[PDB]
Write a protein that binds this ligand. Sequence first.
Ligand SMILES: [Mg+2]
Ligand SMILES: [Mg+2]
Ligand SMILES: [Mg+2]
Lengths: 214, 132, 136, 149, 66, 115, 102
Amino acid sequence: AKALTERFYQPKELKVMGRWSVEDVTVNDPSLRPYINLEARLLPHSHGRHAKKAFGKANVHIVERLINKVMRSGASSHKAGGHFMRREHRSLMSKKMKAYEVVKEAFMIIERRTKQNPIQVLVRAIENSAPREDTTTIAFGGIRYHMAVDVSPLRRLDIALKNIALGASAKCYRNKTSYAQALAEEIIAAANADPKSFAYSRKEEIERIAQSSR
Amino acid sequence: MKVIQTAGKRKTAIARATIREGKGRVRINHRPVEIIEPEIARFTIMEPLVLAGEEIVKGVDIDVKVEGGGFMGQAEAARVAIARALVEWTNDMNLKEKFMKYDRTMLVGDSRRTEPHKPNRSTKGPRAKRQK
Amino acid sequence: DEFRHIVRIAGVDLNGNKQLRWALTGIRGIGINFATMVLRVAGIDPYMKTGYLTNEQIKKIEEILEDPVAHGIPAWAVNRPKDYETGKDMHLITAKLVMAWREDVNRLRRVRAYRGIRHELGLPLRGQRTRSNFRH
Amino acid sequence: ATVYDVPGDLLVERTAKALKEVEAIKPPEWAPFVKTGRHKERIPEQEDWWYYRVASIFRKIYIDGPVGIERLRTWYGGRKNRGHAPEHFYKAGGSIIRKALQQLEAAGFVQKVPGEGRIVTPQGQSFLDRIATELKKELEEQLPELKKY
Amino acid sequence: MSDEGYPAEVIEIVARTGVTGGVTQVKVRILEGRDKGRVIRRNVKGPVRVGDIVILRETEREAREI
Amino acid sequence: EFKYRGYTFEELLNMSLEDFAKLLPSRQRRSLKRGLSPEQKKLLRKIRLARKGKYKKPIRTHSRDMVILPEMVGITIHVYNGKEFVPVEIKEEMIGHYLGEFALTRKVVQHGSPG
Amino acid sequence: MQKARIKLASTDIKALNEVTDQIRQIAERTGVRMSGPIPLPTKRIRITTRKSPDGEGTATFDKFELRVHKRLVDIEADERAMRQIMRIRVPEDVTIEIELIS
RNA sequence: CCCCGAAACCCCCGGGCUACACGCGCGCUACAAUGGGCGGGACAAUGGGAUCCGACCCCGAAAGGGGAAGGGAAUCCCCUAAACCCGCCCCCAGUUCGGAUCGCGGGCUGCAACUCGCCCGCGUGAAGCUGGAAUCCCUAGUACCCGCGUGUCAUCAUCGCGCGG
Ligand SMILES: [Mg+2]
Ligand SMILES: [Mg+2]
Ligand SMILES: [Mg+2]
């Protein structure tokens, strides 16, 4: 950054990025509470070490999961905003340093706004962006019915983070707004639970489709 | 002149740290950690220091020579080397356990290496394949 | 004051009010490199905007364009070095440029060379293949 | 204080500004023209790029010692857009760095080992370390964890 | 935002389900509301371990299967 | 009226090979400075004689890589295209070109319908 | 006293070891100071052919490899030692080279 | 086995296999800000080298040119990689995106560069603003992204085999 103290920021306290603490952070959804890691972890970066196991994601910090979802490249095999995005070389895939700075600028943004811990804001956003029921087709005696099902909290997290990031991506695509700004907007919008957020909207639609399916 | 040598490895990156009594100066290839330009690399290297605390760092001086692959690998190898240096300088197992529960790979190494590339579109990867 | 949303440089090729070097690339025969050269030799700021250009500055870069090498431009940075009728190394602008292209082309045609033939048939002539990827 | 103690880019710009006060650091007549390499696409957009470049070279010779023009060429090179074709690395031109080194040998900052390239002189390392200690102070108003060093 | 959802703790995994194997039938026990101990069998999507907590928009559906 | 590089054809003739080369483009200059092949030299001396003498014959050749010169002007050369010796009456404005540029090998395509 | 480098290279670690043991036991038979069999990086000549003549079918490759193990031994140059290390058998699949540092 | 057998054998010159109204496969570059340019700052590994690598010096705007230490290979060289970071311009548009095409000139290889090579500089400034139906690859240091080496090689790498980030 252009302040030289943000450029050579030195950590001292083991806050997250040496800037934001998590002791004051609380998650009121009990199904997500175990699966949301909020340890005093200075650097979110893990080096893949969790994926080889089945719930290392549970053991993994949450802002790390965010930046990893932000290392995105848009949507290649699906259509967010009705559009394939397909950034190929000008993406952030495998660029976690860029992703880290994107997330950090987003947090700084919202905290300039929102007068709140941005991690608190983020947990609120995934909470009210995370669905509870989905639908899937099951066979009973050989005949398929699009039944409704409940969603496991890990999968709820996965969806929430994914579609937060995807909304940010669609809003930053081919327009004047930055990825960080789109991300900030998406998180606070979802936390306020307004439909402007792609993520809240998507949660509501899969949920109303489920409550239609049963 | 009590000095202690430690070493760290992270995928084609080798750091050699020497630790001794001093003031708190810690240098990576003649350069202060304070000014290492990617924040992430700085933070990888600093984690053991923050975690161990100023109380002992301020009496320690460290110098790391790292001669390998990438900035991140170098940072991790340095992190390893200085973590081991602190532990072997202090003989504090409460600190060893603090590190081992924060990140075990801080003291044990990451054993991972790159998988050899295999024929079909070998330049891309061992499993990356041509299109049908 | 001294503002102009539009400016004529080298006739009435008329240029916006962005920074001057790119405004000049708005001319045929001028890229950003030749532009930066011309301005550096004429003492003008390239980052400057065109609205604040004075008529004498206009005249100055116009005369440079008229005879670049005489002003400090090298001979290896020009549209038309070692011309086919005067060994002078010169830089050509819009109309003289299309005319020069036309002339060398139809010279080749007059002598019925491969390039002239391939020009008049509108096909590639710089070694390409044309089988799979030249389809119009 | 020293070069290794402070960062690079800030030092290069500061010592360039200071090198403008040296008379043996005139740009050559072909500077306002030419690119820095075939790997580039456009002329330098700055007017003092010559001083920035010789400052950089001076620091590089401080750090890497008996080094010459081909090594510096590969450091000042980089990636080229080769059109529709993929990207590759290309070295830079040698004339810029040669003229720079020669200007510096004139000013007294580098000398020329008969073999194995060029080497900074005491007056040269003094110059650089002076600028570095100055800079270190000005950013020790900031980081006292760097006052330490 | 958290509407009238009812927590439910997972006590036992049973066979997996789904045309493509993504679903897992499971036995769960409600924790709050009026049941406060009524086990029930639900078809849950995604990874589950025992001790997990799934929250339900209702409790009177009770899919059953072998 | 023709003026290759500010030089008229008389001057081009009275010139040597070195200076004409200096006037030529880089490729043809390189060809000359590297020197001619024996077949090229034999062709060239045939041409000298034909401007003089008569040579008692038309000039034929397989050499498509011989660059034209002012001496090779006012003359008709028959160049092999692979199948035929095709005639090339050499004007002043072929001055620094190869014979093959005027002797063509592949005839133009007039396509039939796909199938 | 001036020293003698013995660079020896083979495809068989056991022949190589045989030679080095010959040298060790002969130096200690005498008393001249050995410098160990320093093992140098072994050369892996790799040749990756396609194993098909036809050009048809899936492309499959044979990665053939030749390995050259290399040792060097420094021993002080005496006429005795030199005569007898010349007398050494030096089996067929090995090369040696006695340079002298002086 | 049949055939050619003084031609269907051998060698040389030239052309062609590089033609192009079109259909298809695999890929490269892009359609920009999850960026472009300029200047600065960083960090590799694998492999290879005798008429071969060539530091280092000088000349040149570049490509390149002259001389040349050392190196038959853990000694020397190829070899200070790019993606990344910092600052400054550009601020959502067929643009400071994109680089098809073409003109002029300057070079290297070679016996020969037109057909038909590769490189550099000035100039030009093509479609393309995310892509239907349908389809491919992939489970961890993997995929994606980044560049490098080598084989082919007189000169030619959007390829193959490999290397690391
Ligand atoms: Mg461009
Ligand atoms: Mg657009
Ligand atoms: Mg091939």
